[PDB]
Design an enzyme around this catalytic site. Structure first.
Site, PDB file in Angstrom:
ATOM      1  N   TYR A  95    -109.129 -99.272  16.904  1.00  0.00           N
ATOM      2  CA  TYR A  95    -109.099-100.623  18.177  1.00  0.00           C
ATOM      3  C   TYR A  95    -109.801 -99.948  18.986  1.00  0.00           C
ATOM      4  O   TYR A  95    -109.650 -99.487  19.966  1.00  0.00           O
ATOM      5  CB  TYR A  95    -108.584-101.231  18.389  1.00  0.00           C
TER       6      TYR A  95
ATOM      7  N   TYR B 173     -93.211-118.480  70.567  1.00  0.00           N
ATOM      8  CA  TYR B 173     -92.250-118.020  70.237  1.00  0.00           C
ATOM      9  C   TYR B 173     -92.582-116.783  70.381  1.00  0.00           C
ATOM     10  O   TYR B 173     -93.428-115.782  70.522  1.00  0.00           O
ATOM     11  CB  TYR B 173     -92.872-118.112  68.759  1.00  0.00           C
TER      12      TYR B 173
ATOM     13  N   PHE C 123     -98.082-112.238  59.206  1.00  0.00           N
ATOM     14  CA  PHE C 123     -97.153-111.384  58.306  1.00  0.00           C
ATOM     15  C   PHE C 123     -97.568-111.307  57.464  1.00  0.00           C
ATOM     16  O   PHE C 123     -96.178-110.933  56.658  1.00  0.00           O
ATOM     17  CB  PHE C 123     -95.240-111.619  60.391  1.00  0.00           C
TER      18      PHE C 123
HETATM   19  N1  LIG Z   1    -109.847-107.888  13.236  1.00  0.00           N
HETATM   20  C1  LIG Z   1    -109.847-106.282  12.615  1.00  0.00           C
HETATM   21  C2  LIG Z   1    -109.457-107.265  11.280  1.00  0.00           C
HETATM   22  C3  LIG Z   1    -108.120-106.604  10.484  1.00  0.00           C
HETATM   23  C4  LIG Z   1    -108.641-107.261   9.056  1.00  0.00           C
HETATM   24  C5  LIG Z   1    -107.781-108.531   8.116  1.00  0.00           C
HETATM   25  C6  LIG Z   1    -109.716-109.364   9.300  1.00  0.00           C
HETATM   26  C7  LIG Z   1    -109.914-108.281  10.252  1.00  0.00           C
HETATM   27  C8  LIG Z   1    -111.087-105.837  11.985  1.00  0.00           C
HETATM   28  F1  LIG Z   1    -110.888-105.002  13.086  1.00  0.00           F
HETATM   29  F2  LIG Z   1    -111.127-105.020  11.152  1.00  0.00           F
HETATM   30  C9  LIG Z   1    -112.190-106.401  12.210  1.00  0.00           C
HETATM   31  O1  LIG Z   1    -112.720-108.062  11.702  1.00  0.00           O
HETATM   32  O2  LIG Z   1    -113.540-105.988  12.691  1.00  0.00           O
HETATM   33  N1  LIG Z   2     -91.483-113.205  60.990  1.00  0.00           N
HETATM   34  C1  LIG Z   2     -89.612-113.342  61.443  1.00  0.00           C
HETATM   35  C2  LIG Z   2     -89.184-112.338  61.872  1.00  0.00           C
HETATM   36  C3  LIG Z   2     -87.869-113.012  62.379  1.00  0.00           C
HETATM   37  C4  LIG Z   2     -87.325-111.671  62.410  1.00  0.00           C
HETATM   38  C5  LIG Z   2     -87.081-111.227  63.770  1.00  0.00           C
HETATM   39  C6  LIG Z   2     -88.907-110.804  64.423  1.00  0.00           C
HETATM   40  C7  LIG Z   2     -90.229-111.639  63.210  1.00  0.00           C
HETATM   41  C8  LIG Z   2     -90.703-115.119  62.414  1.00  0.00           C
HETATM   42  F1  LIG Z   2     -90.842-115.652  61.426  1.00  0.00           F
HETATM   43  F2  LIG Z   2     -89.719-115.542  62.967  1.00  0.00           F
HETATM   44  C9  LIG Z   2     -92.030-114.833  62.655  1.00  0.00           C
HETATM   45  O1  LIG Z   2     -91.873-113.926  63.811  1.00  0.00           O
HETATM   46  O2  LIG Z   2     -93.192-115.606  63.064  1.00  0.00           O
END
Ligand SMILES: *N[C@@H](c1ccccc1)C(F)(F)C(=O)O
Ligand SMILES: *N[C@@H](c1ccccc1)C(F)(F)C(=O)O
Ligand SMILES: *N[C@@H](c1ccccc1)C(F)(F)C(=O)O
Lengths: 639, 634, 639
Positions: free
Chosen positions: C303, C70, C352
């Site tokens: 956060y 080829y 390729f």
């Molecule tokens: N995960 C956060 C959170 C916020 C609202 C309600 C419960 C939990 C937090 F970052 F605050 C945490 O739980 O540490």
């Molecule tokens: N890469 C492909 C290719 C296509 C056109 C021109 C050159 C090369 C191929 F799959 F055909 C290859 O070269 O294997």
């Protein structure tokens, strides 16, 4: 105004009884949505009959004479080289080929019945060559609630899904059909149950049944109906947002928009000016900014102030897409197009759902834009720093340590908006070269419509949450007014009782009006919180200004009695409130609908219903269209 | 090799009876998927009880002493500056606040998986949850009791986890399933399994909700499926080579040694082995020896570039599995109680970003898998690229009323198209959330859901592809038997008509060379390739040498005898696969699933046939033929 | 630790002088980057010469003898059916047909072109290609002479077209333009002339060997991965500097949190951060800050800091894993056919195919978007007074804030940077078209993907430059803050004595002086409505009640008046003096010192003439050209 157009759509949806299909009267997206969702709505096929029979007779006659016509004496798709005189078996072979979907999930009965109506409508133009009798059968199935079970996927836009409708009509045993919501039977049994017999396909009939855009356009029709209603709902609720957040209604002044005249900008602002004119909440807003004017923002944040500019392209996209979708509903989407008057079959691509596909992508982006607006508004409403007096998370408390308010709805709104923004990437950019490279452009319109529909499901959730939060805010603003007056009363009368001079009384009453009640509601006489802080400041200033032992004695007494009386008096009025300016507001129908008709109340640790339970009710009324009653009451009088 | 690891996962999924949760033994994605999908799989929580009770005791005692610990004596999220001594009320107000989803649900499989993963987190002894709550979780899991949970609301899993907590504390508004047939309010569900509603102690609300259990639950079954479907696609590349008449050289070990991406070496190594002594590769060699200089030197990319293509896909899926299992086996919670050192540690282990990011990558890899399948299917459907196979794999013989797998072909384009769309990232859509406290968040559950949707589509695509390949096997086998007939009829008729040796050779070469599916529809049609070639030969034999009369008689006798004898072998048919490593797949689809060669004479629709294959993929019956095919590979 | 690996990369990039190209010593992304960016770096092709010559003579003989192989006795791609004995013309025709790019100039830069020439030269050393050694020598000479073809930006699906321009240079095509140094462009024949080369005449397989590689995709991926490693380490490190300025709690990085969630990137980033923050003088101030009014201040950080190790985890892992993948490709024989001359076969495959690089480029662009979002969230907190724990909004020094909007412009640009970055991180790999007469029905699009990731990294550099500039502003604001608070304390302390105030008054007042964030009243320290005098007034009233006289009131009024006279003068003086320290004990000293001293900047304010552009430009340039690695390495010394 687009507002009047959308009101007309809602009226038509509510009021239509018969959908007339005659090849001349337009079917709108309200008609499609009505057929799909209201079972009392019937299809009336009016006898365009002559035109249909003429077309049908031409096709059969020509096919039998050996005329060369694609998909009638010819093979299908990339196989159009193959000719045949096997007229019926050619049509049967196509349906057999296309019964190729898999159940993983299905196109719902609403979309399938809509597709049936759309196919029926296409046939009325007299270009398809289908027998009038098959059209009568479609009418009968539509009015009898019969529809095939259709796999969700497989169309690039809608051969496969339409093959199930064809499969029903010819009584394929493998095609399962629904009758109403429960009954599922094989196609032959379903035909029998409604007084029909299976059809034997004649020339072109298989192809005529399958070669349309009925499914993409069916989903796009209900998508557009919903997009229109929810658009108007969001525009309208921007005014409700302004009322509760203490916005400045000047943002909607007509000169601002006349000077930047996008139609959607002018129209949304015109609606908003009208909604906020004579508002009793805007009256409170003006009062709020007159107290410590130069310590408060001159302008609102963007989520309010920039809403008409934001809404403009969104309005325009949803309105133009509606037109485009209706043009597709009322089209002969089929191929070949039979020009019987001129004795020829025309070879084209009317099955190509590209006008729908591209607009579905655009609408999904606009819907994402509506979500972002909602998210931004909801975010401001939850944060003390941006809510102009309202408590963080709209928590009533008064004990905030065991009341996190609408914080759960806040988190959920972020999750909603996030998935919604993801959904809004286009489908139309993913065209594969399909069907032996014959279909080297294809619209993907049904896939796009499906994603826009999912986006609208999320938008409904966001609207439900937003409206629930705003009803909370109305209650909090009305309780705030009542509590500030109680504080003023108590401070005023205790100033008299304690013999405090006018200077002292004037200072103390100013503090009572000025400091946000929700900063100290938790413990009104806590010397650490803003009310007593302000009062102590004033008391020192009064001593200096008046400069004695008598005055100090009296000020110490004023403080002891405030500590004795104030909290009880604030509790009394809050407990009464739990067991009025909205009454003069254009959003009264919304508040009344949510509080009274849906049976909810101010959210707090004392109300046993969860946020879920409250928002679910509001969501269900948006989903089933009951939300249009308060919407129409709110807008009556406009233009 | 990853192939061994994936077979190890399939075995584990099939064989596990008890999942031991003990704070030390790893839970794999197979364990999780087995719990979710096989009702006979039970959880065994192993009394790590000591460390649970120490941690639990430490938290309650410190909280009562008035220690200042986030979410035990303080408000939550952006409200962390508020202090309180209302220990149980604090926890209850959190659950109340988080019961905030809406039914427009997460499935029972996901919910039960989430329950297991939360229980697992607790075993590390950092949460301060009571042992008794863990026992209730184990009992709920083994009794098939699960709360109904809304689909959306998590940015990753406060809201969905609040429904598990809601069940445990008996919230009347929370609905629980008991099996598949029963739905009752939470208090009734607890009652029916001999439990009483819990009263939340210090940190218990927060401990129940502050995890990554739903994102990681969906990600675990996603990763189990992704591994299995990955192996299935790699394996089926070999079946594709066999039916398409590929050149197996593309899988030669030196090609991949010299470009040594692990997924490239390993997939190629599988493919070399699958094709080593193939009967179909033998036919392929025969095919390219006939008119060698009029045929392609190389295969097109869908086959020839398959190992290079599969390489990042294998590696992404393998790496994501590790990541998800690390998350499964983690204390995703906050605060983290370090009781040995007398302190609560404030961090962000609830953050599901490892899982979220890898969910984005795997969805992209799954799209890459879908593209490969689509490219292969497309080749298989087009006569120009299929090396003798009929267009759409239509049997005919009357092609005017048999459009073959054209429906499946269209559907493959729809599948791939939606799949490619799904593969955009969720993780790039981070919103500043929860009073701007959560200004980064992983969106891992949302991402996991999209990767799961992508895999659903991949399953559709695999079912279709396998079905077409079985069709193609039948067509290759019929082809061989048809060509032998043509050769036999040509040979015997040449004898009878007493044609010279020169003539007989030319005609027999034609009979071997022209692809049979180009003329099956009408074998003696003078405009079709068989008779075209035969006429060319006959003119050449006349130039090279009554003779005319014997040639005209040959053409008449062929016109009478040939189609009849071709129809005979075809009808009989309605073998090389017996020697193929893909026999288990063919036997599974044809015999076990009860299917046959697709044609106008077969009443079953493509739907009916592909549905059976799909169902076998969805429920894991496809692993039986897969494991048989791979038997002995090491 | 990945930290060790990245420090290794940086060392290698700075230190390498010759890149040895020998068929067995690996080329790393640092070597590629150093070749591309440091023109003193030379290539050394080490005469692997034997296997190369064996290969090329094997191919020539086989071809001459008419062997079927080829692309040597066969047409290309979809045309592989076509045979020919026209050995050289076949190869010539490939190059002519592949010279098909267009200059829109947009072009692949010299840096990527030269890198691509190195990678092609490297592939050839494995002795699988059949290229003549003399062509390899030519490539070495062109590289060492800084001669590169001008290559169109687009056309590759991954790298036939772009590589054809290198082939075009070698064979002296007049239409191919070549660079010599930075200032000269001549036609290809003249460029070869100037370095003592004659045009090559292509032998069997030589045209194909030159073009059938992943050289361009892998060249851009190499410098992308080099940059991604450096910028990652920089972002991780600067998370510690963010903690210091924002008053974070360094607990978030405690090893046990991460041992218990052991994602390798989580443990390793947290390990780095714990080390950076151990014994920090800024963390000392943080601990003091939270000890004052403890119960009015957040228990946990937001956060953007506290969740940084969990966020970084996958980002670290993706970038490290992609580096391996890209280096495996750099060190591969990406060519086809692969000549196994030992066993006398040409093996037909697809080396390729740049899919490994393509998919990882998509992953990394996603990881980079995650790094941008982390910076954007951190930057956002820093600009907002509510989340910055005493810092002024926008990091505005003022003191007159009405004419100093601080870093607001940078804040706006950070949103613009993140937004575009998130957009870029959509995948390229999902857009596979069936290409080249449907021969290339899968194709990697790796070069396109690598270009987008490079664009993403451009934006990330901008964000890091802004973030570092902001944190240096914050360092100055924290140090000034500490100085200002001490002055307020002293003035309040001494004035309390001098006005003859009681010890319980003095102690109350000193509490206020310690507890009120100085930046809330710097604008006008003795404004009676700002927080200092607010607290002082409350404390003064409480004193009157507690000790409850006319002498007390006289002395308290005097205290207020005299503070009004002195405090502003003293605060102005220490600020002006500061404009004319805890960072000296900080592991981030080399960053602050690099930006302030080496880059010559100062605290940003209305008194500094340099614009934010001018300040951020310097930092950006230092990040772009690698000077930033100097303070990075100093900072990390001993880890
Ligand atoms: N995960 C956060 C959170 C916020 C609202 C309600 C419960 C939990 C937090 F970052 F605050 C945490 O739980 O540490
Ligand atoms: N890469 C492909 C290719 C296509 C056109 C021109 C050159 C090369 C191929 F799959 F055909 C290859 O070269 O294997
Ligand atoms: N819509 C196309 C088609 C393809 C396969 C089966 C039926 C129909 C077509 F372009 F070919 C057409 O019908 O016009």
């Amino acid at each position: 105004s687009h507002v009047k157009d959308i009101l007309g759509l809602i009226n038509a949806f509510n009021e239509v009884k018969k959908i007339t299909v005659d090849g001349t009267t337009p079917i709108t997206v309200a008609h499609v949505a009505a057929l799909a969702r209201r079972h009392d709505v019937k299809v009336a096929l009016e006898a365009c009959r002559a035109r249909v029979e003429t077309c049908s007779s031409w096709v059969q006659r020509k096919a039998e004479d050996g005329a060369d016509i694609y998909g009638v004496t010819t093979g299908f798709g990339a196989c159009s080289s193959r000719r045949t005189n096997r007229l019926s078996e050619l049509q049967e072979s196509l349906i057999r080929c296309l019964l190729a979907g898999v159940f993983t999930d299905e196109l719902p009965a609403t979309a399938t019945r809509s597709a049936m109506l759309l196919r029926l409508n296409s046939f009325t133009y007299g270009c398809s060559g289908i027998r009038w009798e098959v059209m009568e059968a479609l009418e009968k199935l539509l009015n009898s609630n019969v529809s095939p079970k259709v796999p969700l996927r497989g169309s690039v836009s809608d051969l496969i899904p339409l093959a199930y409708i064809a499969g029903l009509l010819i009584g394929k045993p493998s095609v399962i059909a629904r009758i109403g919501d429960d009954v599922e039977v094989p196609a032959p049994e379903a035909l029998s149950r409604v007084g029909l017999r299976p059809f034997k396909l004649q020339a072109k009939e298989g192809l005529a049944l399958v070669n349309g855009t009925s499914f993409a356009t069916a989903v796009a029709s209900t998508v557009m109906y919903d997009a229109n209603v929810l658009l108007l709902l969001v525009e309208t609720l921007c005014g409700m947002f302004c009322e509760v957040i203490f916005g400045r209604e000047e943002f909607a002044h007509p000169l601002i928009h006349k000077v930047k005249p996008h139609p959607g900008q002018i129209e949304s602002a015109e609606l908003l000016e009208w909604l906020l004119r004579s508002s009793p909440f805007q009256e409170l807003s003006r009062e709020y900014y007159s107290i410590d004017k130069l310590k408060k923002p001159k302008q609102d944040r963007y989520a309010l102030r920039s809403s008409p500019q934001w809404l403009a392209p969104l309005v325009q996209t949803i309105r133009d897409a509606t037109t485009t979708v209706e043009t597709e509903v009322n089209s002969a989407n089929d191929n070949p197009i039979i020009d019987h008057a001129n004795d020829r079959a025309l070879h084209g691509a009317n099955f190509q759902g590209s006008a729908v596909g591209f607009y579905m992508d655009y609408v999904r982006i606009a819907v994402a834009g509506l979500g972002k607006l909602l998210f931004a508004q909801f975010t401001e409403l939850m944060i003390e720093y941006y809510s102009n007096g309202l408590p963080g998370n709209l928590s009533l408390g008064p004990d905030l340590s065991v009341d996190y308010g609408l914080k759960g709805l806040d988190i959920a709104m972020a999750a909603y908006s996030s998935e919604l923004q993801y959904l809004a990437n286009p489908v139309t950019t993913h065209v594969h070269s399909a069907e032996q490279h014959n279909q080297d452009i294809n619209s993907l319109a049904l896939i796009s419509a499906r994603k826009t529909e999912e986006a609208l499901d999320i938008l409904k959730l966001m609207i439900a949450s937003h409206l629930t939060a705003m009803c909370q805010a109305v209650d909090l603003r009305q309780l705030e007014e009542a509590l500030v007056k109680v504080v003023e009363n108590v401070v005023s009368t205790l100033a008299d009782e304690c013999g405090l001079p006018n200077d002292t009384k004037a200072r103390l009453l100013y503090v009572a009006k000025a400091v946000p009640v929700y900063t100290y509601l938790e413990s009104p006489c806590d010397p650490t919180l803003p009310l007593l802080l302000g009062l102590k400041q004033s008391c020192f200033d009064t001593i200096l200004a008046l400069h004695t032992d008598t005055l100090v004695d009296r000020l110490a007494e004023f403080e002891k009695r405030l500590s004795d009386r104030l909290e009880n008096e604030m509790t009394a009025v809050r407990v009464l409130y739990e067991k009025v300016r909205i009454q003069g507001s254009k959003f009264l129908p919304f508040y009344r609908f949510v509080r009274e008709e849906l049976d909810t109340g101010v959210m707090s640790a004392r109300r046993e219903q969860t946020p879920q339970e409250d928002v679910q009710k509001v969501f269900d009324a948006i989903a089933d269209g009951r939300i249009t009653v308060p919407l129409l009451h709110c807008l009556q009088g406009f233009l």
